[PDB]
Design a binder for these strands. Structure first.
Length: 385
RNA sequence: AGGAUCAGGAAUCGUCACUCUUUGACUCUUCAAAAGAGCCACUGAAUCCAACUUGGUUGAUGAGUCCCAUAACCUUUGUACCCAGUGAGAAACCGUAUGGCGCGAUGAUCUACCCAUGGGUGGGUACAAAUGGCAGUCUGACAAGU
C-alpha cells in the first residue's frame, strides 16, 4: 500500500462561493504541468466525417476513424504516426487488437484487420455489418456487433471465428465490453441490454435498462457499476454485482450520445454539444446520484465534477486515456483531449500494461499474452468460477 | 515384427545496450515521358542577364602534387652466375741405442660450338648508370557580392 509511488490529481473548490465545474480547459491548461498540459490535443481534421476515438489500453497509441474515410493510428505522445488510411467506404469504429501493430476497423460492410504501416492484413468474409468493434486481450477475442441481430467473436490469435450469436433484438445500438468479466453488453431499441458470453446462445441475462432505445453503456474498471443511457434523456447506474440500477437520472436536457468510465471512478456523459463528468457518482447512496444542479449547495445533492460545452459540434464518442487524466472526445471536426484532474490511475502496474514500452519489451509482452490467452469457453459470469 | 499419418530427444529466463543483415515506409530520384482542382491577388525565397560595387595582368579564375619525374618500362656499357654446385680423389724420405709437418672427410681435388685439358663466342637471370629512349617546360581575364 505504501509502495504505491504516484497519487491522483485532484480538483478542489476551496470555497462554496468558488465552484468546481466552472473551470474551463484553457483555464486548466495554465496550471497543469507542461507535458501533461500539452497532452491535450486539438486535432481538427474538418474535411472528413465525424470522428470516432479509441486509445489503446495503454495510452501509447491513438486510433481515430472519421466517418467518411479516415483511419489514423498515431503514436500519440510523440510526433510519430503509424497509419493514415483513406478508404472511401464509410467506417464506424476501430480498435487495436493486441498492439499498435495490429488494429481493426468497422466499415460499411466488412471489418478489416490492419498493419501499423497501413497495409491490409485480413478482410473478414463474415462481419457483414460492424457498428461496435471491441476487444478483450485476455481472450484475444475481437467481438463485433453490427447492425445485424447477430454478434461475432473472432479469435485473431488463431485467426478464426469462434461463434456468432443472434440476439433476436435487431440492430445493436450500444456495446460495451466488461474489463473485469469479459461479458459483453449489447444495447437495443427496446431499452434492453443483454449480457453475453460466446458459448451461451441465449444471453446471460437481459436487462430492461430504460425506455426508448439504448443510447450507450459504459462499465467500471471494477465491473461493479455500469452506467447506461437511454434515448429517453435518462441514465441508469446499474450495479451489475446485484443487478440493480442505483440511480435513475431522469430528464436530461438532451439524451447523452455516450457514456464513459474512468479508472478512479469518474463518469463521462456526452450529450454531444456538451461533455460532463462526475466524480464518485457510482457509489451506493442516492447522495452519490449524479445530478445536474444542487439547489442551495447541499452536500447531499451531487453536482457535476467537470463540465465542457462544445460549440460547433455534436461529439461522437469518448474514451479516457487509461493511465492518464484526460479523455479523448471525438467531435465532428476531430479530437480533443479534455484534461481531468483525477480520472486515470496514477500508479499503473507495468506487469499488466506498459505505458512506457520498448518494442523488444512489446514483442516479449505480446508472446506473454498469447501464451496466457484464454480459450473462449472460459468467458463466464464470474472470473473466479 | 519393422516403417509413416493424427522416451536413446538440447531448448520453462518480464531486454540493457551494441553491431550486422533483411524488407518496408520516407525527402527525393534515372529509365521517360505523360497527367496536372486549373484563375486572380497578397507576400516570401531562389536563379539568370543587364546594372552597380569591391578585388585583379604587382595576376582574378581554372587546374590528376601526392597513381611517388623522387618514378615506371626499357636501352646501352663495366661486373656475379647458370643449362653455386660437383665430393674421394690428388703425387711417388729422414737431427745426433733410438725421436717426426712425410697428403686427404677435421676435405684430397675441380670450377648449346669450334680449336691438342690455353683462349672465347651465344642465351636467360641481377645491379650500378644514362645531359638515353618512351617523352614535347601550365593557363591568363575575369572573378566575387547586391
Amino acid at each position: 500500500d505504501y509502495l504505491l509511488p504516484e497519487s491522483n490529481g485532484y480538483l478542489e473548490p476551496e470555497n462554496e462561493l468558488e465552484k468546481t465545474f466552472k473551470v474551463q480547459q484553457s483555464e486548466i491548461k495554465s496550471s497543469v504541468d507542461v507535458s501533461t498540459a500539452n497532452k491535450a490535443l486539438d486535432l481538427s481534421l474538418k474535411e472528413f466525417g465525424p470522428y470516432h476515438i479509441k486509445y489503446a489500453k495503454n495510452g501509447t497509441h491513438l486510433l481515430i476513424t472519421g466517418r467518411k474515410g479516415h483511419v489514423a493510428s498515431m503514436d500519440w505522445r510523440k510526433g510519430q504516426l503509424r497509419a493514415e488510411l483513406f478508404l472511401n467506404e464509410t467506417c464506424h469504429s476501430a480498435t487495436y487488437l493486441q498492439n499498435e501493430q495490429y488494429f481493426a476497423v468497422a466499415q460499411k460492410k466488412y471489418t478489416f484487420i490492419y498493419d501499423h504501416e497501413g497495409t491490409e492484413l485480413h478482410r473478414l468474409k463474415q462481419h457483414i455489418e460492424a457498428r461496435h468493434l471491441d476487444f478483450l486481450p485476455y481472450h484475444y477475442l475481437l467481438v463485433t456487433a453490427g447492425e445485424t441481430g447477430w454478434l461475432k467473436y473472432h479469435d485473431v490469435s488463431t485467426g478464426q471465428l469462434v461463434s456468432e450469436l443472434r440476439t433476436k433484438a435487431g440492430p445493436t445500438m450500444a456495446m460495451a465490453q466488461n474489463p473485469w468479466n469479459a461479458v459483453m453488453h449489447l444495447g437495443h431499441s427496446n431499452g434492453t441490454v443483454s449480457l453475453w458470453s460466446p458459448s451461451m446462445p441465449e444471453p446471460l441475462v437481459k436487462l430492461l435498462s430504460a425506455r426508448g432505445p439504448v443510447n450507450s453503456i459504459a462499465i467500471d474498471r471494477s465491473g461493479y457499476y455500469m452506467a447506461t443511457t437511454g434515448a429517453d434523456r435518462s441514465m441508469k447506474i446499474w450495479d451489475i454485482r446485484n443487478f440493480k440500477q442505483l440511480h435513475s437520472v431522469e430528464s436530461l436536457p438532451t439524451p447523452g450520445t455516450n457514456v464513459s468510465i474512468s479508472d478512479t471512478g469518474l463518469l463521462a456523459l456526452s450529450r454531444g454539444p456538451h461533455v460532463t463528468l462526475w466524480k464518485d457518482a457510482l457509489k451506493l447512496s442516492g447522495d452519490s446520484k449524479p445530478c445536474f444542479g444542487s439547489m442551495g449547495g447541499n452536500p447531499h445533492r451531487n453536482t457535476p465534477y467537470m463540465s465542457h460545452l462544445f460549440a460547433g459540434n455534436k461529439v461522437e464518442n469518448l474514451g479516457f486515456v487509461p493511465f492518464e487524466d484526460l479523455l479523448g472526445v471525438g467531435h465532428q471536426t476531430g479530437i480533443t483531449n479534455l484534461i481531468v484532474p483525477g480520472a486515470g490511475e496514477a500508479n499503473y502496474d507495468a506487469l499488466e500494461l506498459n505505458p512506457f514500452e520498448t518494442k523488444k519489451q512489446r514483442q516479449e509482452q505480446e508472446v506473454r499474452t498469447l501464451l496466457n490467452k484464454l480459450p473462449a469457453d472460459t468467458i463466464t459470469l464470474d472470473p473466479n468460477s
